RNA sequence: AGCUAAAUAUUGGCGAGAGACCGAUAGCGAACAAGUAGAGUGAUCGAAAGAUGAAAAGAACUUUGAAAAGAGAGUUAAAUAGUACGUGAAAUUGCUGAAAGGGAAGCAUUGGAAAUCAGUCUUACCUGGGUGAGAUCAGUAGUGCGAGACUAUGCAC
RNA sequence: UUUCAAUGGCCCGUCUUGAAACACGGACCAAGGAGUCUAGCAUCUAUGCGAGUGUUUGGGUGAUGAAAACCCAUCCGCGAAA
RNA sequence: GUAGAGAUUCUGACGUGCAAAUCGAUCUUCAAAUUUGGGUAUAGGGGCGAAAGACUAAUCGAACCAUCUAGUAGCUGGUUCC
RNA sequence: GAGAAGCUCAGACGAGUAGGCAGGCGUGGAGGUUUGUGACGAAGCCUUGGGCGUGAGCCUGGGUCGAACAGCCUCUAGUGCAGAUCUUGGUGGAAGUAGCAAAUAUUCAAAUGAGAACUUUGAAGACUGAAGUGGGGAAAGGUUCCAUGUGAACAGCAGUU
RNA sequence: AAACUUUCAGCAACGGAUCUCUUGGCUCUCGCAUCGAUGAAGAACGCAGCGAAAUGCGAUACGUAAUGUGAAUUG
């Protein structure tokens, strides 16, 4: 497997990825865009706060119809949400990257999220039944997620 | 050039007849040259290989190795030679198959039928 | 803008043969030079006819040559006949006179009978050597409109041309429109 | 009232040899467990689907994780071949970089700006200048009669 | 090459006198996708032979290796007369 | 008037439905020309019809399946490089 | 000499639908030819580099890749797409939108478990209310029955069921 | 100033075009004449150490006898 980027010293970075993860691609993109560039420890704090509805993930691109909240203010937006299912996958991937960095002996105090990317995985297909005996798609939009953390 | 009306040069037919050959036909297809000393002794150029025959590998990464033929995997047109193996991930040694055309026989597993095959093939004992 | 009406703009003639015969190309090469470096209308005539198609170069027989060169007021006694085309035989002429003919092609029978009567056969390059400007030569052509298609060209009411019919006889276009007893005649 | 071989026919069956044929949306519907899966009460209807690698050598072991997995490692000529496997286009998408943006965008002409690309020049040939060493060059002698070219033995030093 | 400024630039295809049309088809991309082959006929051209022309209905070298090449007789077609 | 059998009105809900005919309320009939299981007969210019051209497997002013059949189209659409 | 299919000098002229003709460009396969290219990388593909042509198109650098392929003269055809409510496949914007609201209704504690609004146990609160949400059958299904496990897919939320 | 939108490129996806291949098809030619009440064609159900579809076979069941070959089968 190849990560989409190498924006760090190979010897001073760690990697984690997840493939075919059954969580919404659009929500995951918004989470990734928000935690990218954060320090690893603060990313964990922010993700836990989103779980508690103390902070929110701003929805910037896939925002059609998203509701308004005073928790978007800190990011200068009005549309934000708390996609906890996507949060959990990122929390587990961040934990994996941390353990990978602990295995390479990096200084676990300057670790920064240097790269995070969500790609749309192959869709999984279900059916839904519509009026007048019709059948239409009921697809899932799983995601591929990769994370690179590095010393600042 | 071929001239017989009973011989086909069709690539499709030749490949079908080779890869679809039955077990007894594949035995003749898996033949090896005899060594120079053996050719003169028995007046025979080549023979179908056999288990318990002694060969040396003449081509490939295993060229120059020697050993008995432990098995003749005819389903794969492959010979398994003793002590010609490679290491699996878990340390186990996996045998490496070699084509019969890529070895030369240095000692025959002679027996009653093999002796009959040499005389029938015009050779000597 | 300019108000020019253009009718005879592109010349309608052949500037070279359609044939790929290499020897015809060699003859054209010879007569391109001769028609250019002499003032002879004969050489320009030969060059032009060397380009022409088969239908525009009808054959002529040795009978027609013998008749055309033996008129009462002829003086075409000992002159070379020239045709850019094939010279055929006429077996009806039982006795062939002594003739000198220059032609593209001679039929085997025509050539044999000309020679046997003491005459001579020349190719057009041999003619160029003997009469480089065509002096004292009879330039001849075969009959252009003797071919079958000219029986039919111009067919129409009261034109007396031949119809295109698959077969000949009664029941094949000899009825209404071809006689008074069947409506009208032509 | 009657029989009869051969020369003739042959998109079925069986066996065989070929082709300026098609090359996986093509060629039979079917290159693959295809008249199969599936549909219809029934008569009938009827698909989709080929390719890791020379060889599974199909990733030991360590570590994080409830796990799926990840990260180290490992095998391989190649993992930019990991079976969701040759190559791997486009639509479509994420990240990064660049740039632009007052109710569309795109295009054309001309230049600015920024970015980026090519000149390899004055090589060849000729002459002059400096030193240097060297089997030494024009006319000739001789070896197809008259004239012309050539090589070759010497001299011309 | 990108972008800016100035000037110009309506959405293609189609039927139509006339399409930017408030006429129809066209969300997007790949791959597929429509004047062919045959029995004739007509003009024109090329080639061979020419008052003739056409070996392939057939038969032969032939067995070797032969759907080819090559050779060979009598008819017959078209033409030489309306 | 209940079970059962219907289906008047709301021109109610629904109208990319719970549903290719359903849901609510209202309403008709409710001991007979009543309702109904299973067996059985009638088959396509045929059946069957207390008759609406109704019904005959979501199909009916002539079912469904295959074939004739690439049916014909003076009509519509398309028809590929410089 | 100047591919005589060549070379050279001069003058006039240039809209085009339907339509006609000519000369070219590109594709599969056939004969011939080119001590043709190629695992020291053919073909194919990508390109924020270069060159040629009025154009169809062609050549080339870099990247990717892995087994074949091209030039010239001829032969040949199932030979060139933007359209056909074209065919088959793939994939978009609409969109994290419409929505997932009939059938009164759930709550507490414990156990199990990585994880419990949905499993199991106890407690409470309720409903069907005998023309039943109860207990059986006929038709139809066909193993759906039971136990033990599992929890990828399915159970349009969840999953230890 | 960001976010956002748009275009291009690198990389990563999605998808499976392209290229190369081909135990298949299609077409031509040559050769041959052999089903069944002595139960055919077709259908069903069974048979292997671990075998469901195909091949094969029939309670003698991936087979018995007989003949040939002559060391395999193979997950
Ligand atoms: Mg988008
Ligand atoms: Mg809304
Ligand atoms: Mg529905
Ligand atoms: Mg490679
Ligand atoms: Mg304007
Ligand atoms: Mg018009
Ligand atoms: Mg228009
Ligand atoms: Mg109209
Ligand atoms: Mg219309
Ligand atoms: Mg439309
Ligand atoms: Mg195409
Ligand atoms: Mg209503
Ligand atoms: Mg048609
Ligand atoms: Mg039709
Ligand atoms: Mg013009
Ligand atoms: Mg083709
Ligand atoms: Mg290459
Ligand atoms: Mg591009
Ligand atoms: Mg130019
Ligand atoms: Mg076509
Ligand atoms: Mg298209
Ligand atoms: Mg068009
Ligand atoms: Mg369309
Ligand atoms: Mg909603
Ligand atoms: Mg109640
Ligand atoms: Mg109650
Ligand atoms: Mg019960």
Residue ranges per structural domain of chain B = 1-125
What is the C-alpha separation between A61 and A69, in angstroms, rounded?
17
Chain F bases closer than 7 A to any CB of the protein: 15-20, 58
* The nucleotide closest to A96 (CA, C1' atoms): D64
Nearby residues of C72 by Cβ (< 8 Å), 6 or more positions away: none
Q: Is the CB of A58 under 7 A from strand D?
A: no
Neighbouring-strand partners of residue A127 = A137
The two tokens of residue C13 are 């003639």
What is the C-alpha separation between B120 and A76, in angstroms, rounded?
96
Nearby residues of C81 by Cβ (< 8 Å), 6 or more positions away: C65, C68, C69, C99, C100, C101, C102, C137, C138, C140
User: Which 83-112 positions of B have CB less than 7 A from strand D?
Assistant: 86, 88-91, 94, 96-97
Displacement of CA C80 from its chain's centroid (Å): 17
What is the C-alpha separation between A10 and C130, in angstroms, rounded?
97
Chain G bases closer than 7 A to any CB of the protein: 4-5, 12-14, 91-92, 94-98, 153-156
Q: What is the resolution of this structure in A?
A: 1.9
CB A146 within 8 A of CB A4: yes
Question: Measured in angstroms, what separates residue C95's CA from nucleotide D135's C1'?
Answer: 87
Question: Which residues keep their CB under 5 angstroms from ion ligand 3?
Answer: A 129
What is the C-alpha separation between A121 and C133, in angstroms, rounded?
91
Residue in the structure block whose two tokens are 């009718």: C7
Task: Tell how far the Cα of B57 is from the centroid of ligand 7, in angstroms.
Answer: 78
What is the C-alpha separation between B104 and B101, in angstroms, rounded?
8
The two tokens of residue A43 are 């990313």
Kindly compute the dihedral angle of the four CA atoms of residues A79, A84, A90, A91, in this order, to the nearest 10 degrees.
Answer: 130
Nearest to C96 by CA among C79, C75, C119: C119
**Looking at C52-92, which runs of residues are DSSP E strands?**
60-61, 80-88
**Looking at C9-153, which runs of residues are DSSP E strands?**
60-61, 80-88, 100-106, 120-122, 137-139
| Residue C185 φ/ψ, nearest 5 degrees | -115, 105
Chain D bases closer than 7 A to any CB of the protein: 16-19, 54-61, 63-65, 67-72, 74-76, 79-80, 84, 93-96
* Category of B47 on φ-ψ map: left (φ > 0), alpha (ψ -120 to 50) or beta: beta
Task: Tell how far the Cα of B12 is from the centroid of ligand 20, in angstroms.
Answer: 29
Task: Show me where the domains of chain A are located.
Answer: 2-152
CB A149 within 8 A of CB A40: yes
């Amino acid at each position: 497997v190849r990560y989409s980027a190498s924006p760090a010293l190979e010897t001073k970075c760690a990697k984690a990825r997840g493939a075919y993860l059954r969580t919404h691609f659009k929500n995951s993109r918004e989470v990734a865009f928000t935690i990218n560039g954060m320090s690893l420890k603060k990313a964990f704090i922010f993700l836990d706060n989103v779980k508690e509805h103390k902070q929110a993930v701003p929805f910037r691109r896939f925002n059609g119809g998203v509701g308004r909240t005073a928790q978007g203010k800190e990011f200068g937006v009005t549309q934000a949400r708390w996609p906890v299912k996507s949060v959990k996958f990122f929390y587990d991937l961040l934990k994996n990257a941390e353990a990978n960095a602990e295995a390479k002996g990096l200084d676990m105090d300057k670790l920064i999220i240097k790269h995070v990317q969500v790609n749309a995985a192959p869709k999984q297909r279900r059916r839904t039944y519509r009026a007048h005996g019709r059948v239409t798609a009921y697809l899932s939009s799983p995601s591929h997620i990769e994370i690179i953390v590095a010393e600042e | 050039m071929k001239f017989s009306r009973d011989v086909t040069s069709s690539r499709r037919k030749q490949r079908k007849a080779h890869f679809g050959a039955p077990s007894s036909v594949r035995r003749v297809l898996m033949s090896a040259p005899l060594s120079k000393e053996l050719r003169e002794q028995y007046k025979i150029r080549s023979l179908p290989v056999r288990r318990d025959d002694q060969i040396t590998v003449i081509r490939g990464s295993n060229k120059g190795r020697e050993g008995k033929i432990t098995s003749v995997y005819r389903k794969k047109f492959l010979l398994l030679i003793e002590r010609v193996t490679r290491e699996k991930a878990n340390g186990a040694s996996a045998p490496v198959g070699i084509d019969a055309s890529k070895v030369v026989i240095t000692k025959l597993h002679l027996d009653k039928d093999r002796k009959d095959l040499i005389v029938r093939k015009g050779g000597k004992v | 803008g300019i108000d020019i009406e253009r009718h005879h703009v592109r010349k309608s003639q052949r500037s070279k043969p359609a044939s790929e015969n290499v020897y015809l190309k060699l003859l054209v090469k010879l007569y391109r030079f001769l028609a250019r470096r002499t003032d002879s209308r004969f050489n320009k005539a030969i060059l032009k006819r060397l380009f022409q198609s088969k239908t525009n170069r009808p054959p002529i027989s040795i009978s027609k040559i013998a008749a055309l060169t033996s008129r009462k007021s002829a003086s075409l006694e000992g002159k070379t006949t020239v045709i850019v085309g094939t010279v055929t035989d006429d077996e009806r002429l039982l006795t062939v006179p002594k003739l000198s003919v220059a032609a593209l092609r001679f039929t085997k029978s025509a050539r044999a009978r000309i020679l046997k009567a003491g005459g001579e056969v020349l190719t057009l390059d041999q003619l160029a050597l003997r009469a480089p400007t065509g002096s004292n030569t009879v330039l001849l052509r075969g009959k252009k409109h003797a071919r079958e298609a000219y029986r039919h060209f111009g067919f129409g009411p009261h034109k007396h041309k031949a119809p295109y019919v698959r077969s000949e006889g009664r029941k094949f276009e000899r009825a209404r429109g071809r006689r008074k007893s069947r409506a009208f005649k032509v």
